Write a protein that binds this ligand. Structure first.
Ligand SMILES: [Mn+2]
Ligand SMILES: [Mn+2]
Ligand SMILES: [Mn+2]
Ligand SMILES: [Mn+2]
Ligand SMILES: [Mn+2]
Ligand SMILES: [Mn+2]
Ligand SMILES: [Mn+2]
Ligand SMILES: [Mn+2]
Ligand SMILES: [Mn+2]
Ligand SMILES: [Mn+2]
Ligand SMILES: [Mn+2]
Ligand SMILES: [Mn+2]
Lengths: 323, 317, 317, 315, 315, 313
């Protein structure tokens, strides 16, 4: 440890002295941080912080998303072995990404959870790192948006991939519900519906609150490039937060989720869209609702890890293009 | 509005109740459990058969798997419909066709009698399988009420028209050969969709194979189905193995290269002008299902069929 | 006038069994009548689908449905070794579930207390299916109202659930600490069986740890339980994680070195002289179950509890 | 000695071959695949039936599951026997009894004829199920050969003696009522082990219930079995649901409170005194199995039965 | 016409037998189990290797999983072909290549010798893996027979051409770098289909990545393949991880955004103009499979390869 | 006290932190992830090998599965011990032994060097497998430090003493005996239920023997056999019946319960325990983590034995 010209074969997440660079791993072993990034709470010189919020108390059907962050970390091992495709660079050579670990909260006092998540995000945002957050159920995005609006102003543009709009009316602000937190976000003025977009939608709301909806059928009909171009058109250059609910994907591709809805996107379609979002002013992102107890050979977590990897690459390109 | 267990508490056959999605009585889409058919528009029932299967068994548990997989569909108005179908359409869950499996020759007449009983009420039947053999006695009873020959709209990897001249045989792969021979269905005005297995003699039934559907798309498939059946009385039978094993792992005879659930639902949703007299959704085998995704796709098909009947009940189509 | 299929929704009487295909039919607990009418009822089975108090894996919210599905074989034959059909003499119904607004978690405790209050007003016994173990605390509140306090608790669990907690908290590991402080249970006349986790302060409750049960045997364990509770009113709470993970993999907090189902059932079946006022069977998490074996073991415990009540109603004990 | 695929390569019915455990032709314990019965001591075959089941289906795939689960048993001499039984005992894998499931009344006579054919060779049959109904037509053929009544040694959570006066029903829970009423088995000289379900009329068959076995132990159970059957021609039928669901989750009718595989194997291994004329191992349902543990326990039972016959042949 | 267990009963290498789909000897598509190669057109064999894997192990059980998954394909004429290929094409199941895993340096020559032996008969090889490393020693033997350099048609999420200058290494991700360096395959006349991982140096092999296939479709892809290989002797190697993890979860290195089985089969079925000299289907890992869907997709690919050979024999 | 991710945040190697059981960094029993061995009593490390397996592969993922399965054990004082071992015993998670799998002849010396390096610190090794072959190079390193011959306490359905450069998880204890690493007369195998023509004079308490005579009789026989000799304990999870340990490469019916196995291990406080491993967990075959959970319990109890021995010294 620390010896001159020490080669780092294995366990880079706990051994690498710098936030930059990859190191050799056996894919089936080694410390399982997200894409093997350094485990640390030190935020100096960091561009992106990956962290987990292991919540499933706000779920309406199956529970299990509390284990989502660990599942996505475990599923990210192969993505660490090679330069991401089609990017063809190692993003960690010039993008400083760490794994913070998780947002602790006291589940047994559930009204403390929302402020715990706001404070977690507030703390990270004081560093000027971007947040890439692994869920956990979709409720987490509401306090994340609160903290993001503090830093980046309001209203924000939301880019929301989901089978569900999560904007069903809820007359109780204090409720812990993964299906009504974007109703609250709109009512709080956190997000601008006319400059926001929901992609892969295939469930019904009497009032989508004026948010642009590109439903699953629309995506299938028009294709990924058309979808990507419509997203760019809607958000323009506004500060945008991207929230990816893995149940956007068809249950064939994402069986490991609490509220599966037939007729969704393939991972190919979703990734083609995410990979093309380089023109967007992406301020923060999350990937939510992975429930490993319902996963099958980790395929859901693997797809979630790919989304997260492509989000990192988008940030690498933004940093490298401004250099 | 009632909170919890609407299937056993609502005094009316109409309307939805508030449920926790992970609890409450598990009838199909939470509809009232009852054997009283008076004023009912659609009867959901199960026929828990797998004795006719040629590969894996397990379809005998299909009806309970489809009921359990229907809980999310009861929470919201179906998409893209945007109505609660149960405000205007009276749908009940009858429970199941009982039969003595240990006397398997008694099974065909038990299914015919189950259907004859329900059809006496003028309700439509939406039947959950069970293996595909069940559709043959169901068609016998439907031909009694609606006349013959019927148009068959058949989603499946398999034609189920392989030759079989033994009448009393119990085979999920030959009952539509028997159906054509009995004059129950008109091959020229029938259509098989998603086919990807070989028969030397498809009996003149129109076939839109899986490769055809992939090449031409859902709208083209839908329009070809409409062209073939026209205004004729039609029975729709959906074998979940129509879908690729990726979308429907939970089935007895999986065949690679099938439809997505997005394709299949796009087709079914567009069939509202068809004179659908009855329907079934078969071959769900929960022992081979993975996180219920097969049963979920089956429940979506069943839900869309109810929405087609709601539009017709309401005078829209 | 024996009915064939779907007895739970068809029998006019609360007494008696019907013929079912084991793989079909309405899935109430042991096929008992689904009803909210408590008149003349001896035991009410209900679910409380909670998992918000869990400390490791979630999933117990689906426990009640899993235990119901797992009870189908128990309905087919007279329970063994009893050799009677308990439902000829004991009126048992399935009430469905306690509804609650999960998104307002502070409302859950009073919802469960009210559910139990309502049922206990009928003088039926409650046999409650969990759900995480927190449900037992509000169940005890309601039971102590009816039957007096302090009650004797017979608690099967790998966990004492008596770890100190100073605060309205929702925790399946601290509710028996609250129960003791509230004066709901008498520690000296209470017993915890299968314990294999550490507490600095077991609150004077008698502990028969898993190793003690293995060393002394089921008969010794039963007799020690009986000695501890004597003739006092007792509530029996069975956390399925009492059983070793080999027998009960489907649970949120599995701990190695537990009881077999043979051991647990030998104990429960022998508790016929105890004044059991109520009971529950908790912590079944079907997402972690394997070929339903956990839910099957839970259903067997519940069945035996019913048989104990039948024997008491019948004057045999 | 041959390397790989001994089941399709060995010219002799005797002897073992070197296999990679994770490859090679999957006959039962790698035995020769053949229909030639000349000079054979034991014929292993499958009857892939699950049409007679009352709860979960799946036992139709039992024989293939058991064969796949037997790979490790072929690698070493069985324990505690410590001999390779195939050096002295000629055992083949016949494959399966074919039947037309779509004509279900043809199944019973197909199984009788399957057994009658093999029994003409004087080999013993070790049959892999398949649901328990298969034991009834197997007993019909065995009674033809060995005389009636036979002694039945029956390991099961279920007595399978519930009344059923329709002879041609296909029911895995009533076929031993038919066997008793037909005079195929002598109830007074038969025994049921691991029982933990209720019948109002056990037909006078001796029952050693699961609780009894737990209380008294394998040695006591074994000795009671011997006392009941004495030297009478005995058929052993092992329903894997005798084992607790923890040990045998892969079965159609799981009942809590069962035997461990340690208990069952200790009993079976001790049966060298029994005049064992034929046996089966039934109700493995691989769709419900978990990491093959049920099929593994079933393959162990079958292996031990082969070892019992090796010992009897030597004595 | 025989009823049941045709793999061990048919005296001729041609023709099909009646099987219960859920029973019967489990050779690949029920073909005769034999090591006799006289008059044989195609030999199916397994190479149960996973020592060369970089992530999950489990491919060692691939050959048995693909054989089990092939039962339905044997019941009907393959679609859309509409003929029984086994009436005109003599296909056998050889069993597996045995190797001493405990001496891993012996594995490569064992596989070369397995292939050399089979190829002396002029039968084509259709080989079931096993991890992708197997294709390297297979290409060595194929180059001995058919000359060097061969055209490679490679379906995979991975190029397997990452640099590796240690000769004796056992690595499923570097063996095609070795194949190119050894002059076994011609990069300019080879093609990799479904690629979605990065290499700084694809060695000039033509790449049609997963995104390209999704954009342009099966017909455009198959036509580009034909254009690249022309009439050169071509070896087809199909890594099941070419398919998206939704269709092929049972594999050691799953990568999102892959092909459907509909796309892959449409391409493979269209390759009748290619001078196909041998083929393999690799990386099925049944411990990670879900209701056999991966092994089923793999069996479908193998079936279609057999139908291509039947057509080429007829031409 | 820290709330969450103690494995990467605690400045001291002693003490526990508050964790949500379903979250936080997944080191073994949440111990500090570090390669600094100064002042360390026990080093937990993984050796993710399955190249030596004879049936199912999958043990390469064993160490990660055992780590993940150890989360509940970190929440409470271990039972029946009733102390937090980490207040007095310094335990770290080193991570894993790296090796180049694609050059398999390099693996044995890599494992030896791994152990040699850790043993230079005087910490004890508790190693998570990985297939059983790992114990052979571990024993080589341990015999270098502690002298030849060692006592072996071996829990397994398999004797691994079948007669035999080879990489084989079933022959490495034949080599160990022939190399003079272990003394068979002062060694013991527990749970055995597979056949060898020559058990090499090692004392065997087979599965049936344990079932017949019980855990107390077994543990007393063990203590008797090994006396005060330096002893290495190797626990193959397939010692347990497949009902308790389905997640393993070579499952054999008729095995021990976790209750039996833990009763035996917990009672081994008189043994001069110099090193230990827990091997053959294959998570691809595990069912609701039960195999990995039993393996984590065995490892926890080994830590508790060392805590007691440090206190008794
Ligand atoms: Mn959402
Ligand atoms: Mn959603
Ligand atoms: Mn069909
Ligand atoms: Mn079909
Ligand atoms: Mn508890
Ligand atoms: Mn507990
Ligand atoms: Mn039976
Ligand atoms: Mn039975
Ligand atoms: Mn490859
Ligand atoms: Mn690949
Ligand atoms: Mn070992
Ligand atoms: Mn072992």
């Amino acid at each position: 440890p620390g010896s001159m010209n020490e080669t780092l074969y294995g366990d880079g997440a706990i051994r690498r002295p710098s936030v930059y660079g990859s190191s050799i791993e056996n894919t089936y072993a080694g410390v399982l941080s997200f894409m093997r990034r350094n485990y640390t709470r030190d935020l100096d010189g960091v561009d992106v912080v990956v962290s987990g919020v292991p919540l499933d108390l706000a779920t309406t059907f199956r529970s299990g998303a509390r284990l989502g962050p660990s599942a996505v970390r475990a599923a990210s091992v192969q993505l660490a072995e090679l330069n991401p495709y089609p990017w063809g660079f190692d993003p960690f050579d010039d993008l400083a990404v760490i794994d913070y670990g998780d947002c602790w909260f006291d589940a047994h006092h559930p009204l403390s959870i929302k402020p715990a998540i706001v404070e977690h995000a507030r703390t990270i945002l004081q560093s000027d790192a971007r947040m890439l957050t692994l869920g956990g159920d979709h409720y987490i995005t509401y306090p994340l948006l609160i903290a993001h609006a503090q830093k980046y102003g309001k209203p924000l543009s939301l880019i929301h991939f989901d089978a569900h709009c999560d904007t069903w009316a809820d007359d109780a602000p204090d409720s812990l519900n993964h299906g009504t937190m974007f109703y609250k976000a709109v009512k709080d003025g956190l997000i601008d519906p006319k400059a926001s977009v929901q992609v892969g939608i295939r469930t019904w709301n009497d009032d989508y609150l004026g948010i642009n909806v590109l439903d699953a059928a629309w995506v299938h009909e028009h294709g990924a490039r058309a979808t990507l171009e419509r997203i760019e058109s809607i958000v323009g250059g506004r500060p945008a937060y991207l929230t990816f609910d893995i149940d956007c994907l068809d249950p064939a591709f994402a069986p490991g989720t609490g509220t599966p809805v037939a007729g969704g996107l393939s991972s190919a379609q979703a990734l083609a869209i995410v990979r093309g979002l380089g023109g967007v002013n992406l301020i923060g992102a999350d990937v939510v609702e992975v429930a490993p107890a319902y996963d099958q050979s980790e395929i859901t977590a693997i797809a979630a890890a790919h989304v997260a990897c492509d989000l990192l690459c988008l940030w690498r390109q933004r940093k490298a293009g401004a250099r």
